[PDB]
Write a protein that binds this DNA or RNA. Structure first.
Ligand SMILES: [K+]
Ligand SMILES: [K+]
Ligand SMILES: [K+]
Ligand SMILES: [K+]
Ligand SMILES: [Mg+2]
Ligand SMILES: [Mg+2]
Ligand SMILES: [Mg+2]
Ligand SMILES: [Mg+2]
Ligand SMILES: [Mg+2]
Ligand SMILES: [Mg+2]
Ligand SMILES: [Mg+2]
Ligand SMILES: [Mg+2]
Ligand SMILES: [Mg+2]
Ligand SMILES: [Mg+2]
Ligand SMILES: [Mg+2]
Ligand SMILES: [Mg+2]
Ligand SMILES: [Mg+2]
Ligand SMILES: [Mg+2]
Ligand SMILES: [Mg+2]
Ligand SMILES: [Mg+2]
Ligand SMILES: [Mg+2]
Ligand SMILES: [Mg+2]
Ligand SMILES: [Mg+2]
Ligand SMILES: [Zn+2]
Ligand SMILES: [Zn+2]
Lengths: 91, 202, 97, 212, 25, 127, 97
RNA sequence: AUGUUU
RNA sequence: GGUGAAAUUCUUGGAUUUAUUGAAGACUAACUACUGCGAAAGCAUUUGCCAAGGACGUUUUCAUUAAUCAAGAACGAAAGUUAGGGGAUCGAAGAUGAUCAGAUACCGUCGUAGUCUUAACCAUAAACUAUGCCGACUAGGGAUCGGGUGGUGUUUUUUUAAUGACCCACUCGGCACCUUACGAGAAAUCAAAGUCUUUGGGUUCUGGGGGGAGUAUGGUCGCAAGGCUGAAACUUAAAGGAAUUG
């Protein structure tokens, strides 16, 4: 069954710290404990070590990422921007 | 430990002696193990490569930027931070860059930076939620926590101490020319109060 | 009742038309509703076409025109008499004079 | 009680080596002194002269030309091409209702080093027997016409120097090239190269400047 | 009174009533 | 066989500038405005003040050595009016009639590509 | 498209899925074409290219990853490399390059 | 430009 | 500078104006229309990529798979909320100048939130054509957008021919428009608001004099603002619609 209506993973915090703080924590906790797709082996086996470290349990490859998600929007934008700059300067 | 951004141990060959040289870089986002990092004037514009600031086009995002050529990294080292190349001055060779704080700086065009953004970004977006988590954060940085308010002390302990109510008593904005023991509060504050309006003055 | 067969605007098949600002008072009007007049006045009418042609260093100068599309709100157009109140049947006439 | 014009001297602006006429006019500046040379206050000035007064013929009354002073040579400010724009009168006269306006712009480097942005314009037109009263294009015609114009300007630049492009702009041969390459898409009455913009200059190269 | 301002005044009244009912228990 | 300046008439409402400069525009000669030649605070844009200011500008111009002027006339433009104020025509007529020669009149009013949301609010000035 | 040709091969012809069977077919000389997923590791890609040049076999680089390649060949699992043994009635072997 | 009420 | 006229304001520390530059954010003029697309809200610089869509054409295919839809879902202007970024402009609040009898309004000068963007909410507008959707039929006409067909067609060149643009005629679909109304309507007006006392093609939603009142209460959604649902007591002979003459 569904055990909690809305607190989800933040049920461990009980009634403490405030609902809005528990929500802000819930979003990033789900992000940080999710399993992500390995961009090298194609499996859904990438999990976080410490903040910013994302290791695939298969193929043993670890990539630097965001503190709570494998890729921040800033870093994806920076990746696309640097790709564009490289391609423009080289051609 | 004590750092938000992860480090990358990058092994180069020693160009003058047969051996390996391990280096401790701050990992940029997207850098992975087994990746070939290229460092030098002629390295390609790829995330994780180390380039001189002059060799990158305007708008490039770099990290661990040298303030002076060869100081091995001073700027945009914290998690999620980066420097933006906003232009070059080829004569009197220099690069104008935007620092994380919003400041514009002119650096030698020979100073190096790492392509990309420091990994670990978004870290401060999670509420600590707990004195215990603040405790464990500063346990690996320094003894600066917890902080007793000076207004909760006695006059002997702090400028803000004393009084039959807790209150500063005098303006908390302290002159830049004040001396040690006086510089508690808002040192050399240009202004106070809730920031309303836009930043980046001209 | 409904005063105008379509509306006091020109919008059928659209839903939303981006607004323009009245040149006289800055009121926002939908572009299709605004009263639009073109002005092609001579850059020098000024009673002084002859004087300017005399002072000109160029023979047959062909002095230019100033072009300006003016957008009036209904209130401003009526007040400045770019447009006038018409009879119930005269309103049903879309030709210019 | 100073009369600032008692200490100002005149220089003659010699714009081209190529337009028709070297002398475009005069400009005044403070007499050179201890810590403020007159050449420093000159050598940056841009003048905007009508191409009709540059070429001598009144069929260039639009298309003003910007010329910036590159060097001071003995009371003679030798300038070079700095940009071209149409006049507001001509542009507003060309922009009319009941027709489709088509604009293209490209950024391209001249053969030597000059980075330019070229703004070409064109307008649809009625045919001779046309009864329909607006002659609008279908925006696929507009895309194709803009592609053709962009290619034409990109290949006109990159094969000419700044001087040769400036000498191509006066006959308006690029207008006719666009007309001939677009006449099978849409009639395109009023093709023009409405603007040339200097975005970045090369190293000064006084050797190349000194041709006038 | 204008219907818009009647609605606004009524909404302000409703807010005050909610606040009074909240303070009571 | 002459000396050309630029007339740079800025004919707003509430004022008219007659500002003659060298061909470059950096060096200026005899910038006179209608508020200099009238003291009523409401005749600053009037054609009479414009004519007096243009006459003063023409005198200083052919005292400095300017004989002809290329004319650049403008309104406030930007986002505000786009229509040349009442003083511009009078200023240019006075410049023509004060002995100066005239060349290449052009309207250089700043016109946006639909920028800069206009002042006044969406209901405009309610007078 | 390439996915259509692949589906037709899977339905009609003969094929092997996976690195080991693909290398076996290449060394036996009964591979007509090998399709390598985009995210296949470069070492394995180079080994397959060497085997394919030794066997004079054509190589097609599938633009998707192993997930996309498995989906294209109609399997619910990842496929890093496909080997075509017999095209059946499908023009995948001639509509290349 | 301002000019309330019956 | 600004206005009807002023004043606040800036200004010989050179304001305003001029020229040459640079930065930032927003916006996308003119072209722009009784023109287009989208379920609506909406959508207007170029190019690239990604999927989608209507109409048309079709001697392609399936063969009733359909229409409308309580419950239930997706989207949903602006304002507003939360958290980052951004913050040029304009600008709820606020501050001030002036009018004024008062003017904490209109007008002037600033100016916070907001305006912009990302990630989430909110779910409301005169969200309007105040006109549900599907189907059929009943006048005439000329324009116009998209597609198609035909022509001794005009112009455009490649070498026959050709697309393209245009002209003419037809056609399907669309935004509309003009005239007349057999007909409808209280009328204004309406090709649908017609084919309705000669009253039945299918189907969903809504209303039952004016207030009290979209109020109270309960439920539910929402962070909140609020949304959805929603009375009664009591009161009242009119309220209201269209049109006519003053
Ligand atoms: K404390
Ligand atoms: K104290
Ligand atoms: K004035
Ligand atoms: K702002
Ligand atoms: Mg603290
Ligand atoms: Mg104590
Ligand atoms: Mg003390
Ligand atoms: Mg003290
Ligand atoms: Mg105490
Ligand atoms: Mg009425
Ligand atoms: Mg609407
Ligand atoms: Mg009025
Ligand atoms: Mg009033
Ligand atoms: Mg009475
Ligand atoms: Mg004034
Ligand atoms: Mg545009
Ligand atoms: Mg269109
Ligand atoms: Mg429902
Ligand atoms: Mg919105
Ligand atoms: Mg409603
Ligand atoms: Mg309704
Ligand atoms: Mg009732
Ligand atoms: Mg009535
Ligand atoms: Zn892996
Ligand atoms: Zn108006």
């Amino acid at each position: 069954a569904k055990r909690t209506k809305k607190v989800g993973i933040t049920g461990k915090y009980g009634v403490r710290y405030g609902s809005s703080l528990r929500r802000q924590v819930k979003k990033l906790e789900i992000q940080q404990h999710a399993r992500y797709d390995c961009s090298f082996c194609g499996k859904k086996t990438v999990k976080r070590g410490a903040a910013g470290i994302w290791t695939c349990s298969c193929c043993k490859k670890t990539v630097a990422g965001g503190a709570y998600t494998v890729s921040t929007a800033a870093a994806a934008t920076v990746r696309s921007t640097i790709r564009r700059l490289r391609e423009m300067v080289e051609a | 430990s004590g750092r938000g951004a992860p480090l990358a141990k990058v092994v180069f060959r020693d160009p003058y002696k047969y051996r390996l040289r391990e280096e401790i870089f701050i990992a940029n986002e997207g850098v992975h193990t087994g990746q070939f990092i290229y460092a030098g004037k002629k390295a390609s514009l790829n995330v994780g490569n180390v380039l001189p600031l002059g060799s990158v086009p305007e708008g490039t995002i770099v990290s661990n930027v040298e303030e002076k050529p060869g100081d091995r990294g001073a700027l945009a080292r914290a998690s999620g931070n980066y420097v933006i190349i906003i232009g070059h001055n080829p004569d009197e060779n220099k690069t104008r860059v935007r620092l994380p704080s919003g400041a514009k700086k002119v650096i030698s065009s020979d100073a190096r930076g790492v392509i990309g953004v420091i990994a670990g970004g978004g870290r401060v977006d999670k509420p600590l939620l707990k004195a215990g988590r603040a405790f464990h954060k500063y346990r690996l940085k320094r003894n600066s926590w917890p902080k007793t308010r000076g207004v909760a002390m006695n006059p002997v302990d702090h400028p803000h101490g004393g009084g039959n109510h807790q209150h500063i008593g005098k303006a908390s904005t302290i002159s830049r020319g004040a001396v040690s023991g006086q510089k508690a509060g808002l040192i050399a504050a240009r202004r106070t109060g809730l920031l309303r309006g836009s930043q980046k003055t001209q | 009742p409904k005063k105008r067969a379509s509306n006091g605007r020109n919008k059928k098949g659209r839903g939303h038309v981006k607004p323009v600002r009245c040149v006289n008072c800055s009121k926002s009007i939908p572009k299709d509703k605004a009263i639009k007049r073109m002005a092609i006045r001579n850059i020098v009418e000024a009673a002084a076409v002859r004087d300017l042609s005399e002072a000109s260093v160029y023979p047959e100068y062909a002095l230019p025109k100033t072009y300006n599309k003016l957008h009036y709100c209904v209130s401003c157009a009526i007040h400045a008499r770019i447009v006038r109140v018409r009879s119930r049947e005269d309103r049903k006439n879309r030709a210019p004079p | 009680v100073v009369d600032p014009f008692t200490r100002k001297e005149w220089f003659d602006i010699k714009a081209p080596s190529t337009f028709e006429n070297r002398n475009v006019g005069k400009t005044l500046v403070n007499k050179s002194t201890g810590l403020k040379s007159a050449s420093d206050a000159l050598k940056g000035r841009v003048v905007e002269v009508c191409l009709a007064d540059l070429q001598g013929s009144e069929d260039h009354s639009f298309r003003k030309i910007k010329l910036r002073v590159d060097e001071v040579q003995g009371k003679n400010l030798l300038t070079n091409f700095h940009g071209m724009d149409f006049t507001t009168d001509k542009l507003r006269s060309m922009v009319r209702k009941w027709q489709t306006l088509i604009e293209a712009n490209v950024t391209v480097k001249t053969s030597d080093d000059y980075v330019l942005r070229i703004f070409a314009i064109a307008f649809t037109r009625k045919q001779a027997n046309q009864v329909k009263r607006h002659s609008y294009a279908q925006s696929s015609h507009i895309r194709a016409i803009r592609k053709v114009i962009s290619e034409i300007l990109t290949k006109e630049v990159q094969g000419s120097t700044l001087a040769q492009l400036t000498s191509k702009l006066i006959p308006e041969v690029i207008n006719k090239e666009i007309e001939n390459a677009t006449k099978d898409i849409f009639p395109l009455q009023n093709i023009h190269v409405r603007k040339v913009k200097l975005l970045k200059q090369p190293k000064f190269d006084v050797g190349a400047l000194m041709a006038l | 009174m204008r219907a818009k301002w009647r609605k606004k005044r009524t909404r302000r009244l409703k807010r005050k009533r909610r606040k009074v009912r909240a303070r009571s228990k | 066989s002459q000396v050309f300046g630029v007339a740079r008439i800025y004919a707003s409402f509430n004022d008219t500038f007659v500002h003659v400069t060298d061909l470059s525009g950096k060096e200026t000669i005899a910038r006179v405005t209608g508020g200099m030649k009238v003291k009523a605070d409401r005749d600053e844009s009037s054609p009479y003040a414009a004519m007096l200011a243009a006459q003063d500008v023409a005198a200083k111009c052919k005292e400095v050595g300017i004989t002809a002027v290329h004319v650049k006339i403008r309104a406030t433009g930007g986002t505000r009016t786009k229509t040349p104020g009442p003083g511009g025509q009078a200023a240019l007529r006075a410049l023509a009639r004060s002995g100066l020669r005239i060349g290449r009149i052009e309207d250089v009013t700043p016109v946006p590509s639909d920028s800069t949301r206009k002042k006044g609010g969406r209901r405009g000035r309610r007078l | 498209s390439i996915n259509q040709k692949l589906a037709l091969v899977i339905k009609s012809g003969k094929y092997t899925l996976g690195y080991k069977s693909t290398v076996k077919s290449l060394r036996q000389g009964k591979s007509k074409l090998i399709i390598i997923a985009a995210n296949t590791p470069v070492l394995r890609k180079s080994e397959l290219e060497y085997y394919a040049m030794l066997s004079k076999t054509k190589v097609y680089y599938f633009q998707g990853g192993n997930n996309e390649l498995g989906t294209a060949v109609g399997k619910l699992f990842r496929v890093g490399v496909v080997s075509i043994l017999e095209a059946g009635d499908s023009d995948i072997l001639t509509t290349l390059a």
